[PDB]
Write a protein that binds this ligand. Structure first.
Ligand code: NAG
Ligand code: NAG
Ligand code: NAG
Ligand code: NAG
Ligand code: NAG
Lengths: 261, 41, 300, 49, 49, 50, 93
């Protein structure tokens, strides 16, 4: 039926419209070379602290040496020291040791440049913006059982499509779980995802990329770039044994090779 | 405009600002001048 | 003055071969003479790339401030070391137990302007210290009009070489890439490994496999000339139809994805860099300070 | 808005000074008058013919 | 020694070259493009261009 | 660490992020498929309309 | 207790907190309100660091000569640094 029925029964010559390429179509028609990479897709919406501790014990040992030379700053030196790492104006101790005063000066210079470098680390952690995802393709373990997780999610396709034939020849049980999820329109599933009446939507990759590339809001997020998917193309179907195959196959590769595509 | 795009296409230290910091040095000089004013009186 | 075809097409058109099973970059020129199949891999093109005075001035400034504050201390309307290290502790925000109050006010405001300017310095250098030599653009005029430093080429007499020979204006590149054309891809990986190749045009997933080899082996993000690796064939021949049918039969199930799991999908600022040499220099300063402290012990 | 109300007013500006430069350079008098609408002018089908 | 020279065929490209090609494809004429011999653009050298 | 994170994300809040208040001319996707939001027009019967 | 006129410098040091020696009062009043005012000081320093972080957004250095209207081009020896300007020979310019 449809374009395949028009091409096989010789009521037309060639189909230029968007059409996937699978095995039984390639049995019944002759395809050209593909010119666009169109798979399927699913649309949804400490050693620094160690060395600081070491140099902290070094500074406390030097304060012990100050107490050996020239008075309750034995264990309180640690409290003053890590208080002035952060400079919180905590009442701690008055350092009477000249060695201790010079050491506190050098350590406070180090503490100022360390907190400045930590603000640099805060800005560096701030600049990076990631994009975490939930489903990582058709090989998701959510797809093995929707009751394996507590909310039963909604994954859907379009009716009578080649994606349905690709699923029903991969897993008919996936079709059995999808049977309660058969929806009609592409923009119907678009509105269903924008409202919340749908979780996932299995469809062709490039059409969903075109819909998300112009969507006002960018809430819907694609899954990768067709990594764990059908990985095929859109060619131009011809009749069985048509003489136009060679010229079209050369011309599409010319359209690729001059950058006009 | 397509041919203009085709043939005419182009792009676009710890001593950063001594100017504003030197202005704060002018504020420092005003401060030491006021200290001398309070010193002579 | 006769055209010839070398390489795997040379061994195929002579009859020495029967079927090219290889990463065959499909182009128009090879399509004009032999026939192909539908491509097992979809793959484009990509580029493999590789990854002061003011401190001493503030020291002289706090010296002059200590001089004028000690002159206020003498001309009052170890006190010397206490007042000097009082000024040092005001400068360093830690460790302290009426125009001098005004001068210390001005100096502490000045030191906060110092630390705020250093905050601006680090905030500037955590963005501006990013290399523009990482071009990541074929439409760069540095690539259109080439520079002698930026070394870019590809495999000598490749399909990409023919595709760059065809291109609409890139005879400038085609007469620039002749200086660095290489025979094998392994020597190209070795030459970019020696940081000689500043850029290198090759098919995408090959270098994406080579991206995880070493951490500096970085591929760019642009994806141009989306071509296909397929199986090279003869002319009209009985190994054309059912072979392509079996390829698409491998595409419909996960066998192509199994082959991706074998090799394609398979792979193989912080608190350290800004602080390691700083921590070691501070430790050496602590040791030199301990030596000066023992000098002060031998003083008294 | 105003079907019949046409007054003489005073015009000045950029191209006014340009035309003054032309009349000072080239020997001609002139008569500045405004246009009856607020459009540059486009080619469009009239009622008849 | 002599001002005679060879008319070496060379290849023109650029912006005005594309303008001339599109003018030739639109106005539908033919042309024999060539290069200057004297040098730069022009100057009225005592009532001689 | 709380006041340092507060300083950092307030600098994020007032320095980096900014909405595109301009249109960038022909390269606006919201004028390719327009709506009632970006009201763009020109003078009636002008050469720009031609 | 000597902080009658010294309360100005003391409140200054409680704004900026640069290890200033502070005569700490025994009154809860100034404790609470100078805590609020030093909270304002801390967020003011955060805003000033954000101001200097916004200082590095722009990338623009201005020109030196505005064009032909400069008296540098009218007279080069009137200005002490020597500069040079050239054209192409026999040209329309
Ligand atoms: C899908 O195919 C069935 C079977 O003939 C048909 O009845 C139906 O109208 C088709 N279209 C849909 C569900 O949109
Ligand atoms: C190709 O396959 C068809 C059906 O599977 C078979 O009839 C035909 O003989 C095959 N041809 C070759 C050359 O194997
Ligand atoms: C303009 O031309 C007329 C005759 O053509 C002459 O009498 C008059 O003096 C001219 N005026 C000027 C300003 O040239
Ligand atoms: C002239 O054309 C306009 C535009 O359609 C129309 O509104 C008007 O009625 C026409 N004039 C007459 C006399 O019909
Ligand atoms: C400019 O014109 C003079 C006139 O004799 C000539 O001597 C000189 O070579 C020219 N310079 C150029 C063409 O650069």
């Amino acid at each position: 039926n449809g374009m395949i029925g028009e091409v096989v029964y010789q009521r037309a010559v060639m189909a230029v419209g968007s059409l996937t390429i699978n095995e039984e179509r390639s049995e019944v028609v002759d395809f050209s070379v593909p010119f666009v990479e169109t798979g399927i897709s699913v649309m949804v919406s400490a050693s620094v602290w160690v060395m600081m501790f070491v140099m902290l014990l070094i500074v406390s040992a030097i304060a012990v040496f100050v107490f050996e030379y020239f008075s309750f700053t034995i264990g309180k030196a640690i409290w003053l020291l890590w208080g002035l790492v952060f400079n919180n104006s905590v009442p701690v101790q008055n350092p009477k040791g000249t060695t201790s005063k010079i050491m506190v000066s050098v350590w406070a210079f180090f503490a100022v440049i360390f907190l400045a470098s930590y603000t640099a680390n805060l800005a560096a952690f701030m600049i990076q913006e990631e994009f975490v995802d939930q489903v990582t393709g058709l090989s998701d373990k959510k797809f093995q059982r929707p009751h394996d997780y507590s909310p039963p999610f909604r994954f859907g396709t379009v009716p009578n499509g080649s994606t349905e034939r690709n699923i029903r020849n991969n897993y008919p049980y996936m079709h059995q779980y999808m049977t309660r999820f058969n929806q009609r329109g592409v923009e119907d599933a678009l509105v269903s995802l924008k409202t919340g009446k749908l979780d996932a939507f299995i469809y062709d990759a490039a059409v969903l990329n075109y819909k998300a590339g112009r969507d006002e809001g960018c809430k819907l997020v694609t899954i990768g770039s067709g990594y764990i998917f059908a990985t095929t193309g859109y060619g131009i179907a011809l009749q069985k044994g048509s003489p136009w195959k060679r010229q079209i196959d050369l011309a599409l590769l010319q359209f690729v090779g001059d950058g006009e595509m | 405009e397509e041919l203009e795009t085709l043939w005419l296409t182009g792009i676009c230290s710890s001593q950063l600002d001594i100017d504003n910091m030197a202005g704060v040095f002018y504020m420092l000089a005003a401060a030491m001048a006021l200290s001398l004013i309070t010193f002579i009186w | 003055n006769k055209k010839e075809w070398n390489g795997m097409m040379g061994e195929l058109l002579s009859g020495q071969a029967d079927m090219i099973v290889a990463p065959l970059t499909i182009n128009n020129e090879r399509a004009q003479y032999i026939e192909f199949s539908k491509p097992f891999k979809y793959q484009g093109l990509t580029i493999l790339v590789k990854k002061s005075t003011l401190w001493l001035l503030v020291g002289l400034s706090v010296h002059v401030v200590a001089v004028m504050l000690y002159l206020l201390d003498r001309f009052s309307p170890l006190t010397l070391s206490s007042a000097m290290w009082f000024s040092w502790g005001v400068l360093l925000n830690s460790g302290i137990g009426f125009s001098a109050r005004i001068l210390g006010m001005v100096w502490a405001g000045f030191a906060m302007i110092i630390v705020a300017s250093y905050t601006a310095n680090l905030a500037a250098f955590l963005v501006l210290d990013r290399p523009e030599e990482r071009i990541t653009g074929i439409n760069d005029p540095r690539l259109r009009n080439p520079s002698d430093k930026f070394i870019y080429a590809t495999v000598k007499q490749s399909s990409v070489d023919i595709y760059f020979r065809r291109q609409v204006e890139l005879s400038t590149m085609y007469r620039h890439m002749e200086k660095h054309n290489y025979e094998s891809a392994a020597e190209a990986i070795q030459a970019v490994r020696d940081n000689k190749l500043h850029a290198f045009i090759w098919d995408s997933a090959v270098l994406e496999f080579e991206a995880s080899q070493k951490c500096d082996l970085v591929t760019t993000g642009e994806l141009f000339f989306r071509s296909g690796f397929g199986i090279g064939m003869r002319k009209d021949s009985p190994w054309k139809q059912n072979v392509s049918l079996s390829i698409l039969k491998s595409h419909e199930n996960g066998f192509m994805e199994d082959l991706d799991k074998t090799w394609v999908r398979y792979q193989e600022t912080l608190t350290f860099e800004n602080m390691a040499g700083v921590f070691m220099l501070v430790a050496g300063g602590i040791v030199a300070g301990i030596f000066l402290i023992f000098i002060e012990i031998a003083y008294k | 808005g105003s079907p019949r109300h046409t007054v003489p007013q005073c015009c000045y500006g950029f191209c006014i000074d340009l035309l003054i430069k032309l009349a000072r350079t080239m020997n001609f008098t002139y008569e500045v008058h405004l246009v009856a609408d607020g459009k540059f002018g486009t080619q469009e089908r009239v009622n008849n013919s | 020694s002599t001002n005679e020279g060879m008319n070496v065929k060379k290849c023109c490209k650029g912006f005005c070259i594309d303008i001339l090609k599109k003018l030739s494809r639109t106005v539908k004429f033919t042309y024999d493009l060539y290069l200057v011999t004297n040098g730069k653009h022009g100057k009225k050298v005592n009532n001689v261009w």
